[PDB]
């Protein structure tokens, strides 16, 4: 038998990956200097440099995972890989929209919003109950030392649960690229005025 990838997903072009990575680093520098963040440093961990705090960063180019397959060992991996839309789309370019950036004490990431065509590539957990399909879609930008990058999607889902119910509060800041919200418990969300568009190739990563 042939094995499957470690995971499928959208892998950004170098130019797009560079643009988004730089936007994430600027956000981290801006957020860490904001009075509202500094005041709540107790709920999070002299000043903290968030670039340092998020000291594990993706090597190479950034990506947005669809289905983790573990070469076929993960539940649902074979069903996912055999879909016509997955086979037809393999190697094809797509444009992903980034609508928000977020930081928690564990991860820093970018929220991805998918087109209908891209949702067809999203696979069919309790953390996401009552949210739209594809809510977990994200690009990991940084993790704290003891954190695994899969936490980024769980962090996003938790943020979205508060946003859904209107608990994001009034905006606590305007940054150059959008509106900043303090969600409590170390969680911060920058809702971008203009969605960022990044070009990516849907393919499989093998390690």
């Amino acid at each position: 038998k042939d094995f499957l990838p470690l995971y499928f997903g959208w892998f950004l072009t170098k130019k797009s990956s560079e643009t988004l990575r730089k936007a994430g680093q600027v956000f981290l520098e801006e957020l860490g200097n904001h009075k509202a963040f500094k005041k709540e440093l107790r709920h999070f961990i002299e000043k903290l440099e968030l670039v340092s705090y998020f000291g594990k960063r993706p090597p190479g180019v950034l990506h947005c995972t669809t289905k983790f397959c573990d070469y076929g060992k993960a539940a649902g991996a074979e069903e996912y890989a055999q879909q016509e839309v997955v086979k037809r789309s393999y190697g094809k370019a797509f444009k992903l929209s980034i609508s928000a950036l977020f930081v928690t004490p564990k991860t820093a990431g970018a929220q991805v919003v998918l087109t209908d065509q891209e949702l067809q590539l999203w696979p069919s957990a309790s953390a996401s109950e009552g949210l739209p399909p594809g809510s977990r879609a994200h690009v990991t930008l940084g993790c704290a030392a003891d954190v695994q990058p899969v936490q980024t999607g769980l962090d996003l889902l938790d943020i979205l649960q508060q946003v859904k119910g209107g608990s994001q509060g009034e905006a606590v800041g305007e940054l150059p690229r959008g509106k900043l919200y303090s969600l409590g418990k170390g969680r911060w969300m920058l809702s971008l005025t203009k969605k960022m568009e990044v070009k990516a190739i849907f393919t499989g990563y093998y390690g």
Partner: nanobody
Amino acid sequence: VQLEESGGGLVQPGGSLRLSCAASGFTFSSYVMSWVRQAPGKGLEWVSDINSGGSRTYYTDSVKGRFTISRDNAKNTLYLQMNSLKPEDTAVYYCARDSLLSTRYLHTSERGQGTQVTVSS
């Protein structure tokens, strides 16, 4: 980008309203469209959204089975049929461009002026 809501009003619990939102200034048939609402003393919260062709809809668990979102792309109009209304449904309702997940509705330029819905005796 223009969004004009209408259809709000006062109703008794169990009653019905239909909100409308006429869109202009963009290619309406290209966009997911959303309804959000803000109850007194609370933040803007999700209600429902609908994809461009109208084939996919989303509802928060709190309105599921009672509200129906729909659209008429030829008339560039979005609708929210609100049945079996409860006092908990009292709020200002806003139509917004793009999906709920996109949080476009958090930006003033992306939403309409809002329409009052009040449910009591």
